[PDB]
C-alpha cells in the first residue's frame, strides 16, 4: 500500500483510418491556420469537442423537465459560455451540436496573443508564450494551449520582467552593448 | 510571490516544548546524536545475545 | 499428476545445474581464473589488486603478480591475474584461459582508445563471463556522483548494453564483488571446451 494516485487519462483518440486525404488535408489546414505542433493537438481538441457533443446528446435524450437535464445542461452551457465558445444568447443544448473545432482552437492563448496584436504571427505568438513573455492578469503563462476565458481576455499583458515590457534587456543586447 | 507557514510563540520555553525537534535544530536550539539506523539496529541485535550488565559492554 | 510431473522435471534440472555450478571453483575442480583488465589509463591497478586480496598465496613474475585466493568462508578458490591493454598476446592469452574477465573503468569516460582496441580484440576472440567495475566514483563530490553513474551508463550502453556497474572503493565492496563473481552464470566457449587446455 502506498499513498499515491493511479488515475489518469489519454486526452486524444487516434483516428480509426490512418490514411484518407480529406482528414489529412483538414488536419493540415488546422495546424497551419493555428500554428500547432502536431496532429496530436488537433486530435486533443477533437476529443474534447466529441466528449462535449456526446454529453449534450445524452442530455437531449432526456425529458424537458428532468432535474438532471436542467442542472447539468445549465452547467455545460455555462462552462461553454465561460470559455468564450458559445454566445450568452445561444444558451440552448441544441446549439452545442453546432460547434466546430475552430472555436476551441481560437480560444487558446496562442491565438489570443496573435489576435490581440502582441505577436506578428501565430508562430511568433507560440515562441513568445513559450519564452516567458506573456502573462494573464498577474501570472506568467508558459502554456500555448492555455484556454482563455472571457473575463481573462482583457488582461493579457506582457510580463513586467520581459525585455520588450518592463525593460531589462536580454542576453544578446547586453552582450552586444559591451563590445563597444 | 512565495507562500509559507508561520508560528509566533508566547515564550521561548513554549517554543522549546511544542515545536518539532527539527525546527528547533534549524535555529540551533537542538542537536541530535550522530548515529545511523544500521548501527543502532545491529547494536540492539547484539545486545540481545548477552544477559545482565554485559549488555552494556557492547561497542 | 501434473504437479508431480512438474516436480520431477524441476528436480532433474536443478540437480544438473547444481552439479555444473559445484564443479567450478570448488574442491573437485580447478581454481576460478579471473583476468583483470583496466580499460583506461587512469586506473591504479595495484590498489585494486590490494582490494581483491580468506588467504592469499602471492605468486609473482618479473613484472606481473598473479595470486591465488582461498576463501572457505564462501568456499571458493580464485586465481587472479592482471593484464594491461595493448599487450596483445598477454591479454589474448590470459583471456583465452580465463573464466571471468573483470573490466575496470574510470568514472569520467568509459574507456580510452587502447581500451576500445583491446575490447574489439576480446570481442573478436570470444568473451567469457565478464563483470564491469568502476573504480573512482567515490572520489568525486557527492552532488555529481549519481549523475556521473547515469552518464557512464551511456558510456557503457554502446558495447555492454544490459549490464550493471559495480563499485570498487573499500574492502566491503571488494567482498561484494567477490560474491558476485563466485555465484554467477558462466559463459561456456566451444573451442576451449572441446579441447583440453
Amino acid at each position: 500500500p502506498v499513498a499515491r494516485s493511479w488515475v489518469c487519462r489519454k486526452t486524444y483518440v487516434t483516428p480509426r483510418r490512418p490514411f484518407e486525404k480529406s482528414r489529412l488535408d483538414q488536419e493540415l489546414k488546422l495546424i497551419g491556420e493555428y500554428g500547432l505542433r502536431n496532429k496530436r493537438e488537433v486530435w486533443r481538441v477533437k476529443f474534447t469537442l466529441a466528449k462535449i457533443r456526446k454529453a449534450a446528446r445524452e442530455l437531449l435524450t432526456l425529458d424537458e423537465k428532468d432535474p438532471r437535464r436542467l442542472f447539468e445542461g445549465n452547467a455545460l452551457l455555462r462552462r461553454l459560455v465561460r470559455i468564450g465558445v458559445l454566445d450568452e444568447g445561444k444558451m440552448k443544448l441544441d446549439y452545442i451540436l453546432g460547434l466546430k473545432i475552430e472555436d476551441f482552437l481560437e480560444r487558446r492563448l496562442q491565438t489570443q496573443v496573435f489576435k490581440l496584436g502582441l505577436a506578428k504571427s501565430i508562430h511568433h505568438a507560440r515562441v513568445l508564450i513559450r519564452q516567458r513573455h506573456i502573462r494573464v492578469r498577474k501570472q506568467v503563462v508558459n502554456i500555448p494551449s492555455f484556454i482563455v476565458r472571457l473575463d481573462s481576455q482583457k488582461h493579457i499583458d506582457f510580463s513586467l520582467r520581459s525585455p520588450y515590457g518592463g525593460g531589462r534587456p536580454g542576453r544578446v543586447k547586453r552582450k552586444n552593448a559591451k563590445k563597444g | 510571490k512565495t507562500t509559507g507557514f508561520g508560528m509566533i510563540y508566547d515564550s521561548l520555553d513554549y517554543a522549546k516544548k511544542n515545536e518539532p525537534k527539527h525546527r528547533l535544530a534549524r535555529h540551533g536550539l537542538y542537536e541530535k546524536k550522530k548515529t545511523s539506523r544500521k548501527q543502532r539496529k545491529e547494536r540492539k541485535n547484539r545486545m540481545k545475545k548477552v544477559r545482565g550488565t554485559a549488555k552494556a559492554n557492547v561497542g | 499428476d501434473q504437479r508431480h510431473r512438474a516436480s520431477q522435471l524441476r528436480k532433474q534440472k536443478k540437480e544438473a545445474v547444481l552439479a555444473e555450478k559445484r564443479q567450478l571453483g570448488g574442491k573437485d575442480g580447478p581454481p576460478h581464473q579471473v583476468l583483470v583488465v583496466p580499460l583506461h589509463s587512469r586506473i591504479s591497478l595495484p590498489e585494486a589488486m590490494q582490494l581483491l586480496q580468506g588467504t592469499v598465496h602471492l605468486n609473482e613474475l618479473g613484472n606481473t603478480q598473479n595470486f591465488m585466493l582461498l576463501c572457505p568462508r564462501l568456499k571458493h578458490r580464485w586465481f587472479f591475474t592482471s593484464a594491461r591493454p595493448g599487450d596483445l598476446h598477454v591479454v589474448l592469452d590470459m583471456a583465452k584461459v580465463a573464466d571471468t574477465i573483470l573490466f575496470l573503468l574510470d568514472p569520467l569516460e568509459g574507456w580510452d582508445s587502447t581500451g576500445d582496441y583491446c575490447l574489439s580484440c576480446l570481442f573478436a576472440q570470444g568473451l567469457p563471463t565478464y563483470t564491469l567495475a568502476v573504480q573512482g566514483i567515490s572520489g568525486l563530490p557527492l552532488k555529481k556522483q549519481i549523475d556521473t553513474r547515469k552518464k557512464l551508463s551511456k558510456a557503457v550502453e554502446k558495447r555492454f548494453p544490459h549490464d550493471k556497474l559495480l563499485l570498487l572503493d573499500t574492502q566491503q565492496e571488494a567482498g561484494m564483488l567477490l560474491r558476485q563473481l563466485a555465484n554467477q552464470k558462466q559463459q561456456h566457449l566451444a573451442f576451449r571446451d572441446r579441447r583440453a587446455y
Binding site: - | - | 574489439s120 570481442f123 570470444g126 554502446k158 548494453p161 566451444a190
Partner: protein, 141 residues
C-alpha cells in the same frame, strides 16, 4: 427455426455453448493442447541454440534458395528452423550460439513465399541483428 419462448434461456445458452465448441479459434484457445503443442509454449519469443544452417527452396513460379538456421529451443528442447533477413546477416550467426527467435509475423501462419518456415531471428549473442547489420554494435563470440 429458433425457439423464442420466455422460458427458453437454458436451451438457448446450452445450444450456444456447443456451437461455440464448433469454431476452430474457440477450440484452439480453449482446448489447451495448442499451447501444449506450440514450440514457443504460448510465448512471443524464445531462445535457442543454433544446431546448424540449412537451406529451404522457395515457391515453384519464382525459384529462390533461402537460408535458415536450425535451432533447438532452451526451455522445452524442440527443434525449429528460423529465417534470416539476408545472406549477409547469416555471417553473424555460428553453430552453438544463443539466439532469440520470434514468429514470422501474421499471428502464427506460414510464409506466402518461403514454404514452411515459421520463425525469424531477432537477436544473436544477446545483441540484435538490426544493430549488427547497420554497424551500430558488434557482437561477442
Amino acid at each position: 427455426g429458433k425457439c423464442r419462448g420466455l422460458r427458453t434461456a437454458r436451451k438457448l445458452r446450452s445450444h450456444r455453448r456447443d456451437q461455440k465448441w464448433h469454431d476452430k479459434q474457440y477450440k484452439k484457445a480453449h482446448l489447451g493442447t495448442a499451447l501444449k503443442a506450440n514450440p514457443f509454449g504460448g510465448a512471443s519469443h524464445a531462445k535457442g541454440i543454433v544446431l546448424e544452417k540449412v537451406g529451404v527452396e522457395a515457391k515453384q513460379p519464382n525459384s529462390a534458395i533461402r537460408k535458415c538456421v536450425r535451432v533447438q529451443l532452451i526451455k522445452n528442447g524442440k527443434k525449429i528452423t528460423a529465417f534470416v533477413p539476408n545472406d549477409g546477416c547469416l555471417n553473424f550467426i555460428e553453430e552453438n550460439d544463443e539466439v532469440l527467435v520470434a514468429g514470422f509475423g501474421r499471428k502464427g501462419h506460414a510464409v506466402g513465399d518461403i514454404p514452411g518456415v515459421r520463425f525469424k531471428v531477432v537477436k544473436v549473442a544477446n545483441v540484435s541483428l538490426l544493430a549488427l547489420y547497420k554497424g551500430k554494435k558488434e557482437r561477442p563470440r
